[PDB]
UniProtKB/TrEMBL annotation, chains B, C, E, F:
Keywords: Hydrolase. InterPro entries: Cytosol_ACT (IPR040170), HOTDOG_ACOT (IPR033120), HotDog_dom_sf (IPR029069), Thioestr_dom (IPR006683). This is HotDog ACOT-type domain-containing protein. It comes from Staphylococcus aureus (strain Mu50 / ATCC 700699). Belongs to the acyl coenzyme A hydrolase family. SUPFAM superfamilies: Thioesterase/thiol ester dehydrase-isomerase. GO terms for cellular component: cytosol.
Length: 164, 164, 164, 164, 164, 164
């Protein structure tokens, strides 16, 4: 199948952190971060897929270090895994000084056709070491995400029964 | 000291406005995550009786598309209490006001950490369920928690690698 | 056909963000009114089992200042059911998560009208209280309703005069 | 006491109604209207008072005619009554063609000093007929607002008892 | 066919809040520009008697910092009428309610084009001044118009050239 | 002291949604301008190594309508370095993910000034280009700078004159 580099659809974001972006302890609101993460990931996935996409799941968001008033942020997003119709997008959130990693997130997107049906996406390959790390560690993440979906179906059925 | 899941359980009924949705009239994943985080944090704060921070979004499963004009019900509760951490589960339902029936649109799990005035992790009360759904989430929590703990290991591996 | 006040009762737990407050860190009256209207409409829709429109905001009493960082609980319910109209009462409380205690920050009464698919006023179910607070608002509704009806007269006088 | 004309602090607003401002039946959201109303009223009150102000209450908002996608709106706000430290602001919302009155609102504001204590405001006088209508009909509205406050205190006490 | 400059004059009043400012309490240029575009568009729309689009924004100089708590009045009117295009002049004033002071902080010029339902440029009424200030803007418009028209060519050229 | 133009280059990616457009699916100029100002400021801040303020925005020509669903890439870099001031050039491109097409829709120039903690203008590093496109902007900057500097005088004059 047609292949793309991870760099090819890679997206960047630069953002300032203002007092209105943080709580009274000067820590940036998680919701704002989450909104930015999803936004940049969706564009990256659309670029890789060459089609419209939908967020299937947020696999994880880890908040490693507090982001503070006055900090400058750089977001880096890229496709780290390509299934048949699905993509894993990895998003790094760094505090710009040289850069410190403030947060790490993985999301899964599904490409859709004009009919709204899942559509095939190109494969992806890394070119430099970091890209290779994310590419190499993805299959394990994917398998875990799949196991979690399996368990989730049990909960959904229980919750559907709870309503009747 | 222990609290019931009901003591800190939180609800939110919300309309989905155009500012919340994309060009396909589907609610932003980022916005949903921000709303989820917002209500979950309040639940965690109520349970801990102290300030909290979002440690992670463990997962968000986007089950059914949420559309402009939909009515949503968010339900959040503490399903697990560690030493300093809490798992909050958030159910996001699409309310059918005409038929008094609701569809589960999304399911999310998050981890919060309670802090003292000095800003260091602080002990939280234990938690216990009382009704069936509470018991379902409470009973299935240990397996999720083990996964979260497993993820932390990998995040640390990636951080360690990225420091290059 | 009659419904209990509990059947359509709605809740909202919300954090107050900087985007919601002025330079004195006080929440906008307009924003509070928008949130009030939003939750009240959902309650009215649930009760009517049909689409609704806001006929009027009968009053909003701003009792205690709401500040950036506050946690709010909104509670909305139908306190009166006319032929096509409903009175919805909304309580806005400031939650003290530390002490599990809340202060009443604002009180509001609104009138909604149910509509059919053709867009004309439509009959709504009757309403009855079950617990003490519900009974309080239900019992005091007739006096408020007479005031609202009295106001309509004056609004019509003013409209009639303004047509000049 | 020092006196100001109603025209002296009068404020205007012109706004377009876009599809994103209206629901699926092309009717403008009440919350947006309410937000604009409070915003313009607060500025009018500040201008009249020559000081910071707070919204004491929203005395009423009547939605007389549906506002639709593509409509052009004009807001007119002015002080129609001046107590000792308080002001009534009347806000007219018109659909611009010659103009049709879509909504009518009355709010009460309280002027505060730098210490945050209620402060005396100038008196107000009308100059043209419409201003005179609003000025002339105010005392009755004020008295009704006062009677309503009296009743509200009973509810607040009941709700405060309900919590213990 | 001719209209006065005052006939289509539009207003917007808004105060500057902390969420609108940087770390030192200075208003964002983008917020100001968004507001300018909004009010100018309404004026142009009213004068044209049809939908409009922004063809261009002339430069804007920020001479003095606009600060948290400042109250701004935006005033817009048509200063020139071409065939299908209009120059809109927007005055941005700081209202100092405390001292009854009204200072002009910034001046902005924009060009709007009237369009028909087919989306094609449409003839507009002409415009005429009535007082000295209106006449000043009216008199100085032609030079600005000829310069921006030349500038459009320069812009097209630069874009075409860079696409290489 | 010198920095490359690429060294402080900043990015922002955002798609155009219905809430961002007028009745005919065309993007608001104000939204574009807000985005431009945001990304330019971050670039200037990074290059300066200090806080910055927008001194001015050169004119912007809207040559082609930006439409609902378009994906925009904002790219900002410093094209000129004065003593305390910088010219920031912002390219706005429409990414067409479907066809792997990247077209330059608009170009914008802004002037930023670096300030010290006292709020006084501060010396900035110089800037140098490395590739042809950077060099083009670098080469054409002085003319733009001298013209805007003259224009500031004109702006001050006009404001001083109108205050009469
Ligand atoms: C309400 C206002 C909005 C906000 O402030 S929240 C927006 C999120 N923004 C942030 O900046 C959060 C930054 N993250 C941090 O500060 C973290 O390091 C945090 C949560 C304080 C933990 O600090 P540490 O020094 O690592 O403490 P610790 O290692 O002993 O762990 C304490 C408990 O927290 C858990 N934890 C830490 N990191 C986690 C993670 N990524 N995901 C899930 N769980 C995590 C950890 O398992 C531990 O649990 P327990 O105490 O054994 O029950
Ligand atoms: C959820 C999406 C957001 C929205 O659409 S709501 C934002 C508000 N925007 C609007 O455009 C509402 C416009 N207002 C209207 O359309 C009204 O005329 C309305 C409510 C439909 C009533 O239409 P009418 O032709 O006058 O019908 P009607 O005179 O027979 O009265 C029907 C019931 O409604 C009541 N009512 C009408 N106007 C009212 C008012 N200002 N304040 C309080 N109550 C009012 C009226 O008392 C009557 O009650 P009942 O049926 O006897 O129980
Ligand atoms: C995913 C969705 C589009 C349809 O689900 P579906 O019918 O089960 O799709 P399919 O069964 O045909 O599976 C096809 C792909 O979807 C992936 N997928 C489906 N659900 C997933 C989930 N919870 N998590 C991760 N991947 C998922 C599958 O892995 C598969 O990818 P692959 O074949 O490349 O391996 C829908 O459930 C959904 O996501 N609604 C939410 C709307 C939304 O996301 N709004 C906010 C962001 S736009
Ligand atoms: C009103 C408030 C400032 C303090 O109330 P208070 O202590 O009772 O004030 P006072 O008893 O000293 O009364 C002084 C004035 O307030 C007026 N007032 C007080 N409560 C009022 C109410 N519910 N409705 C109308 N007027 C009221 C009184 O009429 C009086 O005016 P007057 O002397 O000119 O006739 C406070 O309760 C409040 O409004 N908090 C809400 C914050 C807010 O409004 N946020 C959104 C908008 S900024």
């Amino acid at each position: 199948r047609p292949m793309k580099s991870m760099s090819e659809s890679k997206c960047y974001k630069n953002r300032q952190v203002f007092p209105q972006d943080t709580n009274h302890h000067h820590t940036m609101f998680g919701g704002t971060l989450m909104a930015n993460i999803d936004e940049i990931a969706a564009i990256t996935a659309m670029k890789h897929a060459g089609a419209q996409v939908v967020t299937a799941s947020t696999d994880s968001v880890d908040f490693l270090k507090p982001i503070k008033t006055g900090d400058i942020l750089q977001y880096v997003a890229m496709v780290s895994y390509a299934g048949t119709s699905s993509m894993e997008v990895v998003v790094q959130i760094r505090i710009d000084d040289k850069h410190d990693l403030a947060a790490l997130s993985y999301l899964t997107f599904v490409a859709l056709d004009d009919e709204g049906k899942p559509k095939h996406v190109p494969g992806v390959y890394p070119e430099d070491d970091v890209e290779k790390w994310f590419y190499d560690t993805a299959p394990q993440r994917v398998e875990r995400r799949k196991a979690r979906r399996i368990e989730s179906k049990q909960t959904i059925e229980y919750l559907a029964q709870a309503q009747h």
